[PDB]
């Protein structure tokens, strides 16, 4: 039992609004993190057809800021699976819709675990990579899992 | 000066969460309306490269509900333009990620106006329909504009 | 099963709220979506007071924004049940913005929504009939069937 | 010198009680009710003074009853009396039980609001003109309450 | 019979003051400060009683200073005294000026929290053991405050 | 330009918050994203108190969730500046959940963030050096350079 990465790929666009932002109008790091987890959860739920929980997130380096009201664009997809777990890759851009300037904000990996109605880990289907980027992320996922185990 | 409909097409997926919902867990009509306007604003801003305001929304018939935490999926695109105004079509589905059940929630049209930094209406580029659905929505937009004028 | 009607006055609702930065676009004008969310909120309160039930929004009619509030204004909303079907209620909502510093009050919009009472299963449930009492209420009641025909149409 | 009827300031709010607003048994937090009381008081005082305002104080608030999820809270505020830059605002809060239609008095409170100019300095406010018997009674009794606020804040 | 040190209940919160929380001049709404005071009081009382709680009352709250955007508000609460099912909770609030580092006392307040069982009925609470001199003084003076709350709520 | 350091104690921050339904998945477990948002919030407060400046989040290190709070628990967060660069501060944040009904307290996670002070233009700005005083603070200070090398690496 397997599904393509495309089945669960999720896209989001959010207007950056005053409450999301700090008193100079820059988006809070924590709002970006919340949105990253939201898209990873949606992505993992689509792949597993299950409630999910976040087991961990890898380091997140914020390469650029976003300001009120840029658009924040997020993409997520499942890159690799374990028995009950899914690695999800999320890529975030900010898009200044007035100027057309679009910049990479961050990219990261999360580990999501499917759980049943009682909260017990639940087996998940395998993922089938199709693009070259997908195939590369899948081939490199075991190594990332080993670093998580070490840390 | 014109751009394809695809340039401004915007997709959103949102997890339906307890605060979005009523004490029986059904999403509030008004949250759906807020999300519809948000995606229309993003769509119009992408087309016009401008701040926008909502001049009006047409009637919205809610064909189905969404529950916590379905995914709500929204798509918006510019269908037709006036001098400073854009008609934006928005289509909303609810997706029960546990069961795979996906249902049309609503579809509607909004009228967005591009405004300059001082809030004055601003000319917008024309839109170039490419699909058959796009061509049909564009051909039918003048008639919808006439009904708005009458009402 | 109840025979009596309930007066419009039973469920008439007033809200007043200061316009704050979350509600507003980067030029300080309130988002249409925020006004729409508040319109539904007041319609939901009004319908719940009439039906003493959970409710869902079946539809909203077209909304034309006649003006826009600015961050810091007060938004003033009033809603009331204008007419009833079997399980459905028409709710009329009127919105104004009030500049509290200058005293300028302007009409924002007016709207009709259709609210449906639901049981704990989410299935439509009968509602009490409404009784119009003021002349304004009676005029809205008189004109409700024509409005409902258009909704049947679309 | 300038005075306006109480009715100019009078403001009503209604709020739905939802799960984020309540303890795990479904009783609304005291703090949400307090938040709503100050909100309506600020609106009331802004209407009377046509100014930004700040909350100087709130008197004690005794909760006579609760409200629970899906109920509605109804608030009403009006200016009852004024000093030079300060306004006493009375607020009453009721719950409306959305299953039975029963209205219950939740609490009542007085606040002291201060009008401020654009630099945040206290600014003169007009007087209020009581018209109902309730308003006249609250106006008549306001000086004593003001004296109590002076006493309680003294060393 | 059972008693616990004040320290078991003691709770600290810090909150950033942001634009949604303030008037258009940037001064935090009184109501937000009140909301935060009840939040910390509920946490405090839940820790003391290991129970759901409801707010019975808050005494008067006099705002000694303001807080403004990007400042931080610091709150501290602890149980000072108990009755059968009720707890007096003292809360202090300071602003921390994020440009200068200056801390200013914003306000202080007492609340009355009531522990409730799963049916929402008042439930017995343990006593509190004051240890600091401040705690002993607040404990010693609590009966008089309780008597005042009885008087003010009487007909 | 200031010569003196500031002690860790200047900016150490504690937060406590009840877990409510917005924070939670449909089975009542708190979202990772909510915990992450609260971790950043406390790191931002801590860094602002140290630098007396606006700040931005440059990065967060990996976060492993050791347990999950349930709606109604209290989340307890503590943050403090562990080490400083020129414009950057390392912030350590520790999170626990506390079941207030049962008294059970469990470690949720621990995390390191890098916060950068910025001027009104958004450009990095120098920060004061931090002084570790407790043994815990001194150990974290001692081990910060190794952690910073890994960040330089990625
Ligand atoms: C991080 C950022 C401030 C770096 O700015 P810069 O123009 O490259 O300037 P510098 O190279 O002098 O970096 C400033 C400091 O950040 C540190 N830094 C930069 N990226 C970092 C990272 N990913 N992790 C840890 N530290 C980092 C630098 O080492 C430097 O430290 P130092 O001054 O003590 O020596 C910049 O890339 C940025 O604004 N990113 C977005 C931050 C943001 O907006 N976050 C909110 C959510 S999007
Ligand atoms: C609207 C809805 C309740 C209709 O339910 P149904 O199973 O078709 O049952 P009925 O045909 O008996 O409809 C119930 C009432 O709604 C009315 N109705 C249905 N759709 C309507 C619409 N688009 N506009 C106005 N009234 C409508 C019917 O005319 C009927 O009125 P009546 O009972 O007075 O005669 C149903 O489609 C629904 O739950 N939609 C989603 C509502 C919702 O969840 N909104 C929140 C945001 S998604
Ligand atoms: C209340 C405050 C404005 C008083 O201002 P001030 O510089 O002392 O100047 P004044 O003495 O002229 O006070 C203005 C009015 O406030 C009244 N006042 C001050 N403190 C009061 C209190 N604790 N309770 C009731 N009235 C009070 C004064 O009696 C005066 O009344 P009057 O003008 O009608 O005679 C000031 O202490 C303050 O800004 N507090 C913070 C308010 C705030 O920001 N609250 C929101 C949450 S922190
Ligand atoms: C406060 C309340 C629980 C009192 O309960 P009750 O059924 O009257 O039962 P009791 O008389 O035994 O009250 C319990 C304790 O509350 C105390 N109390 C009641 N009202 C009080 C008030 N206004 N101020 C201070 N203490 C009060 C009583 O003195 C008693 O103290 P004790 O047990 O230590 O001797 C009840 O009136 C209530 O639920 N109010 C609403 C609370 C609420 O929901 N607040 C949130 C926002 S609406």
Q: How far apart are CA D16 and CA B22, in angstroms?
A: 10
For B77, other C-beta atoms within 10 Å of its C-beta total: 29
Neighboring chain E residues of D52 at a CB cutoff of 8 Å: 23-25
Starting from the CA of residue C84, give the closest ligand.
2
Residue pair A44/F34 in contact by the 8 Å Cβ criterion: no
Handedness of CA E131, E137, E142, E143 (dihedral sign): positive
Neighboring chain B residues of C51 at a CB cutoff of 8 Å: none
**Rg of chain F taking only CA atoms, in angstroms:** 16
Residue pair A76/A100 in contact by the 8 Å Cβ criterion: no
F57 in contact with A, Cβ within 8 Å: yes
Residue owning tokens 């014109």:
B2
Q: How far apart are CA D12 and CA D44, in angstroms?
A: 9
For residue D37, the Cα-to-chain-centroid distance in whole angstroms is: 5
Which are the contacts of A74, defined by CB distance < 8 A and separation ≥ 6?
A: A11, A12, A13, A14, A35, A36, A39, A90, A91, A92
Q: How far apart are CA B123 and CA B151, in angstroms?
A: 24
Residue pair A42/B15 in contact by the 8 Å Cβ criterion: yes
Going by the DSSP 8-state scheme, the letter that residue C21 receives in this structure is G
Q: Is the CB of E121 under 6 A from ligand 4?
A: no
Phi-psi category of residue E41: left, alpha or beta, with phi > 0 → left and psi -120 to 50 → alpha: alpha
Task: Provide residues with CB under 6 Å of ligand 3.
Answer: D 54-57, 83-86, 112, 114, 122, 149, 153; E 27-28, 30, 33, 62-63, 65-67, 106
**Which tokens sit at B116?**
């300059």
Q: Is the CB of F124 under 6 A from ligand 1?
A: yes
- The domain B1-151 having CATH identifier 3.40.50.720: the answer here is no
The CATH number of F1-154 is which of 3.10.129.10, 3.30.460.10, 3.40.50.11260, 3.40.50.970? 3.10.129.10
Angle formed by the axes of helices E30-49 and D30-49, to 10°? 170
- Strand, helix or coil for residue D104: strand
Q: Which helix (H) or strand (E) holds A126?
A: strand A126-128
The CATH code that applies to domain D1-155 is: 3.10.129.10
Which are the contacts of D88, defined by CB distance < 8 A and separation ≥ 6?
A: D79, D80, D81, D82, D110, D111, D112, D142, D145, D146
Residue pair A37/A110 in contact by the 8 Å Cβ criterion: yes
Residue owning tokens 């347990």:
F67
Torsion of CA D133, D135, D137, D142, to 10 degrees: -170
Residue pair C13/D98 in contact by the 8 Å Cβ criterion: no
Residue nearest to atom 47 of ligand 1 (CA): A29
**Which tokens sit at B57?**
């929304």
Which are the contacts of E9, defined by CB distance < 8 A and separation ≥ 6?
A: E44, E45, E47, E48, E77, E78, E79, E89, E128
Going by the DSSP 8-state scheme, the letter that residue C122 receives in this structure is S
Handedness of CA A139, A140, A144, A147 (dihedral sign): positive
Q: How far apart are CA E17 and CA C20, in angstroms?
A: 14
Residue owning tokens 């997890």:
B15
Q: How far apart are CA C109 and CA B56, in angstroms?
A: 10
Find, among B50, B40, B41, the residue nearest to B118 by Cα. Answer: B50
Size of interface B-D (CB pairs under 8 A): 11
Q: Is the CB of C85 under 6 A from ligand 2?
A: yes
Starting from the CA of residue C91, give the closest ligand.
2
Which are the contacts of C105, defined by CB distance < 8 A and separation ≥ 6?
A: C76, C96, C97, C98, C99
H-type alpha helices, chain B: 5-8, 29-48, 132-150
Angle formed by the axes of helices F32-51 and A29-48, to 10°? 170
**CA F126 to centroid of ligand 1, rounded, Å:** 12
Q: How far apart are CA E64 and CA E35, in angstroms?
A: 17
Find, among A114, A134, A121, the residue nearest to A41 by Cα. Answer: A114
- CA distances (Å), B82 to each of B12, B85, B125, B131, in order? 26, 5, 9, 20
Torsion of CA A57, A62, A63, A66, to 10 degrees: 120
**CA D113 to centroid of ligand 3, rounded, Å:** 8
- Strand, helix or coil for residue C136: helix
Residue pair A102/A63 in contact by the 8 Å Cβ criterion: no
Regarding chains D and A, contact by 3 or more CB pairs under 8 A is answered as no
Q: Is the CB of A111 under 6 A from ligand 1?
A: no
Going by the DSSP 8-state scheme, the letter that residue E7 receives in this structure is G
Give strand pairing partners of A12.
Answer: A74
D20·B23 Cβ contact <8 A: no
Neighboring chain E residues of C99 at a CB cutoff of 8 Å: none
Give strand pairing partners of D95.
Answer: D73, D104
**Which tokens sit at E124?**
């017995």
Could you give the angle at the alpha carbon of D79 between the alpha carbons of D74 and D84, nearest 5°?
150
Find, among F72, B65, F34, the residue nearest to A38 by Cα. Answer: F34
Largest CA distance in chain F: 53
Handedness of CA B16, A58, F15, E7 (dihedral sign): positive
Give strand pairing partners of F126.
Answer: none
Q: How far apart are CA E150 and CA E129, in angstroms?
A: 24
Residue pair B16/B67 in contact by the 8 Å Cβ criterion: yes
Residue pair D27/E54 in contact by the 8 Å Cβ criterion: yes
Q: Which residues, numbered 78 to 117 in chain C, qualify as contacts with chain A under a Cβ-Cβ cut-off of 8 Å?
A: none
For E81, other C-beta atoms within 10 Å of its C-beta total: 24
- Strand, helix or coil for residue B122: coil
Phi-psi category of residue F124: left, alpha or beta, with phi > 0 → left and psi -120 to 50 → alpha: beta
- CA distances (Å), C20 to each of B125, C76, C106, C138, E71, in order? 32, 14, 18, 36, 19
Binding region of C for CoA: 57, 59, 64, 66-67, 86-88, 148
User: Which technique?
Assistant: X-ray
Find, among D10, D13, D92, D16, the residue nearest to C14 by Cα. Answer: D13
Q: What are phi and psi of B93, to 5 degrees?
A: -120, 155
Phi-psi category of residue F28: left, alpha or beta, with phi > 0 → left and psi -120 to 50 → alpha: left
**Which tokens sit at D27?**
């009783």
Residue pair F71/F23 in contact by the 8 Å Cβ criterion: yes
Residue pair E113/E56 in contact by the 8 Å Cβ criterion: yes
Q: How far apart are CA D10 and CA B27, in angstroms?
A: 33
Residue owning tokens 């007041």:
C42
Residues recorded for chain F: 154
**Which tokens sit at E90?**
């003292």
Question: Please, how many CA atoms are within 13 Å of residue B49, restricted to the half-sphere of its CB?
Answer: 11
Residue pair D85/D123 in contact by the 8 Å Cβ criterion: yes
Residue owning tokens 């959010």:
A14
């Amino acid at each position: 039992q397997s599904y393509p990465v495309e089945r669960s790929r999720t896209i989001q666009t959010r207007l950056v609004l005053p409450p999301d932002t700090n008193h100079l109008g820059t988006i809070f790091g924590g709002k970006v993190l919340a949105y990253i987890d939201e898209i990873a959860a949606l992505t993992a739920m689509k792949h597993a057809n299950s409630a999910v929980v976040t087991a961990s997130i890898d380091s997140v380096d914020f390469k650029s800021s976003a300001t009120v009201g840029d658009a924040l664009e997020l993409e997520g997809f499942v890159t690799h699976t374990g028995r009950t777990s899914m690695e999800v890759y999320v890529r975030v851009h900010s898009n200044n819709l007035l100027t057309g300037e679009r910049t990479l904000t961050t990219e990261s990996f999360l580990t999501m675990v499917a759980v049943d109605e009682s909260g017990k880990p639940k087996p998940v289907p395998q993922v089938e990579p199709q693009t070259e980027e997908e195939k590369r992320l899948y081939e490199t996922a075991p190594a990332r899992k080993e670093n998580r185990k070490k840390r």
